[model samples]
Target chain A: ITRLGLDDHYHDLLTVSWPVFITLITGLYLVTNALFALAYLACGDVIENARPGSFTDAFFFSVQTMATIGYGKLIPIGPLANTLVTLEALCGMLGLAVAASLIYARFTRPTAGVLFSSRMVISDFEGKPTLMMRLANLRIEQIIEADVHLVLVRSERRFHDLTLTRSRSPIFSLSWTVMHPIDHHSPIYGETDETLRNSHSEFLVLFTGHHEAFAQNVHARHAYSCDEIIWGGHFVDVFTTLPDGRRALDLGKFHEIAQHHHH
Target chain B: PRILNSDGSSNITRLGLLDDHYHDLLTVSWPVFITLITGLYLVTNALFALAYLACGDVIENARPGSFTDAFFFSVQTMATIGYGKLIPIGPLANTLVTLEALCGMLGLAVAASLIYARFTRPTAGVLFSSRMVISDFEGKPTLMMRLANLRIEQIIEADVHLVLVRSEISQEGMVFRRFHDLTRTRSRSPIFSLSWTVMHPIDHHSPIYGETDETLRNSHSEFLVLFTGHHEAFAQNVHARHAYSCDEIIWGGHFVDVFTTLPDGRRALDLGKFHEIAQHHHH
Candidate 1:
């Protein structure tokens, strides 16, 4: 089958960086103004107060005419000059309208703000080995109806979903621990650290949620390698009670783990 | 798989911290955008007027003394109104006028484009049923909800996911909200031009198994439905979500068929009846 390279080019225009976008717009403006200035210079003696043969005077007058900022000192004297002014004015108006819409589009697109834990942990849960990872909301706006899915990849291009003990968060404010019990049915069941390394195992996590403030859906993803998994270790207790008896979560301890310690 | 930092933290970047200036502007509220446009228009015009006033005796055919007259002339020129009551006379004044006119044209074009983009951005118009239902499906209990595209645009390669969330008292006597993935009967569709009835069979392995409607309500159960699909018209990914609280779930009820055959031999879907439901004997 034959294919054209035109696919995705349109979408790319909307996603490029601000610097590139600004440069393109500015370049267009400069080129258009230069062309109009040249046209005005060509209409010699038709523009009043224009230094008869001075290109700079004619060009400057062209600018005034194009922007329609006709400071009466240099009005169009003949039919050709007036016609050119009319055309340039219309072009200027239409060009600006197009630029306005593009700017708006660049600013208004919605984005998701999820943060994944630094490492995955395999530890004891209910007398069985379990895979665990933590995620938290970085934005002040509440993330409602949040969900996480874990996929276990055994080898190249081979993966399966791991059923989690709990993967949904009604209101994600601080943190969530996504746990998947490594039971008999699990793809990583009965696998040791060496086995995981030999098989080139990897874990992919997909997170989705609705942003309350933006009222839009956002998605994020993270992946874990076998080496990144800490066996027989669990997350340190980050929750605490303030002097007034209010519950407080110390995020500084989010990455701390009690290594090889059993509960 | 990405590498973890030396501090044993996964090097995953926070979505909020990423410097996406363009997207930030796009998602800003309408009032702020309007204020921004107005501010830019007024500020630029004011600056241009100030420049014209600074150049003495540059404006012709008007009182040479007042800044207000020069400012008004600047406004007329910037907007391309060119009423011809006042005009630039000297070479320097003409040059400045040219520059202002070019800037004004480009500025207005940008403003117009922004307005057009704000109004024309693609959005999913999918509408979910007011209430979800739990009724018998294939002789087994099932939870279901109906949704339809409110717009004429068709959604392609649609996928649906349902998650059951409830507060659980763990062995440690600590209460925490837990989530369970509800396996759907048909989780994917090639095209979703019409209504879709998403169903999750309440099998033995299901989280809601052996639980009564009252028990669900007491446990503060909620169903989170996430639907994602390709918007055919916009050639972009679109997503919609609907949360159904315990109170919004109708026990022992099922959605009514909204399809009908018209007298003109054409198939019709009555979207007005999308929310209609019928009670089953299981209650």
Candidate 2:
């Protein structure tokens, strides 16, 4: 009958006690796998007779079969075992396939930078030295019109990468940019040597973009370089922003013309 | 900042908010929410397509089941994560589930195979940077290369290995394609920093001097190196010599140690004395 925090109800309903759930799942997995192995043991005379006298053998057998290594050396013998095993094999295949799919999905799902380089680079921009990060619009059949920006933030003392002050590059903009062009140079390009670079050698680049059509968020991150200080070529902006106070360029049909200059 | 009181007032306020804002009538049902969130345009369109099939009598008129049952069955069948709690009662149901199972299994296989293919398929045209060494072997500098994980997400593990191979072309052209006995447990990330040393430098002669230069170009210009190892999730190798047609490099990088950067600014890989060696090669 006691009260708690404001969002206590939400936390209580959604937040899982990981240990309990993990134990539950593991127990279920082992028990179910054992059942499958027992079924396999009932398949034929060979498996029924040669089956290990205990749960451990059946459990290991089930695990091996579920993993699909099968080994071909151990197989079910009795009819009941065979029937159960055939089903188990089917189930094993299905479970393995699903588990594999989920794992693959989790691993393959996009991370921060699918498009850009891992480390931040200093590149020549017009005539100034600035920090730059790269990003790619990787999705097919979808055109992402976005705005990008950088935010510099300090890392906590107990953090992992290194105990140093760092700047996090963050991007903002869902569709159009009125202040500046998206694909043009960053505002950070004008940082002079006297400003802040010498003190905070450890820095981070956080790139964010808001996709207009899909209403999704995209991002990338890069750690900075220590020794090399690139001049002129400081930062390169690869994101596209819809232009304000001007007609939108039709990316579908637009062909860029080579600019020839004689100065 | 003063701590808030742990009295009944906070609970009352929260309950007030819940009563005023968290109205069940206003809230969408879970299934509705799931359908709405996932359905949007494509999934709903898919449902509509399935409905159209039903309306057009794609199945025989004497079918034993309803459209909804058939549709749910279709979903389960396609996902291939069959719960088996539901079973087809009639021939029509059985036939549909079978077809659905086959399609589901095949679709899953295809997706898996494609993921594996995508997981294992070698990337071409990308180049990684080589070390910018200012001097010879007296000092080994840390060479940094920038590489983007082309896949949606990939775990990259790298090691430096030294090898001496027999070259057919130059007598000297037989450059070392890779080092020997070097193995690494798989990792998943986009970039790799490979440090070379006198003990583990790529030192083999080449059949074609061009091959060595080409490999250097491939390293410095492209954004990646051909790593042969088990992809942790996929358990497949992008550069498996046994699977592909190629002479196995005699020397290859191995898993001496692994370093990972903790998201919280912690160093993970145990570079060991290699880090010191890298500094010596620093430009």
Candidate 3:
């Protein structure tokens, strides 16, 4: 499934897959009506009320002139059989407008439906060592202006940009969490747990916003690693203190977590 | 070891002519694009069947210099399909059937403007999570991935990017490829429709830090994910992409729970266990 890049499957056949563009426009209209019924049997006897050389009356007079359905009872008497029935009616009017533009490029496409959080915790927040991760908004409208950008990558090679407490959020319509704070201008400060799982390092994060329903600016990213984090837990609070209390959101404890370690 | 040009293009070739005849007919091959549209519909019906066999017997009920009945009466007058039993008597076969009916409806209006501009391209139903997990969540060692959204309609502000590329050896030894972006834990989603698990937190400024999986598969590295949004029935801006390599990521894998629990309490989304992948029985 790799090798994609050489003409990147032509940017994915107009955003790829859909009964393979409906069998490529129904096998391009069944092979241009069987190549105009073999160009009306090489136009020898040239149709006239049928049966001159009958290849089923020149293939039903080439599908009654490529479906112009003249039904005039298979005619075409001369100028070389009405120039092969006017080039099979310009091959059925340019093959039915290229099968309605290949099924209108097989139903246009543009996509995204964000949802992330398979795990990434790290624990301890109000007394040092943090690094959470949470998210929501499967849709109901609202993602304006939200932003974020973590990045880390260290194995001793490079990249840092960590620092995130609330990297911008005018409106994200629900869930976020995100945090970072590892301490003393942290770049993952004094790594532990065997130098964070033998330093395979990686964090990444990114995220963006502003999709007032069609205003677009959307972007997303993620990368985790160090054994998918976890370190001591935290984050289990889907904030449900309700009863007209105005702040609900109990999304089954959104990717729950809780633990404790004081490592 | 690898990054760019091996087909994702840009090795820069031929640098000439109409660079994209509609991206070379949308990257050819559908049996060479229906054999070049049936040899361009047989080169305009073989040049008007030699202009109706040089107009001598001038058609009507047959008999003349038959270029096989002038190529079946120039394919029924360049496709106007009359079948009035072949007519066109004289005056240069009635001005060559009004110049082949103004050249077959101007060749069916520019072949319907190049198949309506290759079906007005655009699609981002998005889906990708075959590999890249590296498990663990509240126990550190993160770096995971997943994204679904086969679409039912919805996706405003959705964004995501991952980068990574790979290939160094500089110190003036001159080579290339490097990129390295990754920073996703929840890259925005205002509304997105279904799945997304994208985490990264391997922390310590990860570019896959101390690397492994055989130093990112013998340093041939990869990773490029992207997702953009604002589609909700396509008002546009629908970006999407996915790439992996580094021998398909997944170190202690993980990802199975498509978030279920709907015997009645609601909250579904199994998506046939979306890309499945399992491990870490831990306990």
Name the best candidate (by TM-score).
1
CA deviation > 4 Å runs, candidate 2: A1-94, A97-101, A111-145, A153-198, A201-203, A209-218, A225-263, B1-283
Candidate 3 interface RMSD after superposing interface residues: 12.1
True contacts kept of each: 0.23, 0.01, 0.35
Q: Which candidate number has the best DockQ? A: 3
Candidate scoring better on TM-score of 1 and 2: 1
Query: How would you encode candidate 1's per-residue C-alpha lDDT over B1-283 as one tens digit per residue?
Result: 2222322243467797338745655677977875666566657767876787777778986567666566566656777668585779888779889998898778776666555655555556677888899899999999999878765557765789888878899999999989888999878754577788989899998899988788997777777888888675454588877777777788888798878666767778887778899985644
lDDT per residue (tens digit) for residues B184-281 in model 3: 76666545677777887777788876677888766677787888876645445678777777777777888887877666676677777788887656
**How well is each residue in A14-112 modelled by candidate 1, as lDDT tens digits?**
556789879878888877878876787787677787787777776677666655666777766544665566556656665666676567656666666
Q: Pick the candidate with the highest lDDT.
A: 1
Runs in model 3 with CA error above 4 Å? A1-28, A31-57, A60-91, A94-96, A99-263, B1-59, B62-75, B80-107, B114-148, B151-193, B196-236, B239-258, B261-268, B271-283
lDDT of 3 by residue, A118-149 (tens): 67887777888888787776776788777776
**What is the C-alpha local distance difference test score of each model?**
0.75, 0.36, 0.69
What is the TM-score (0 to 1) of candidate 3? 0.32
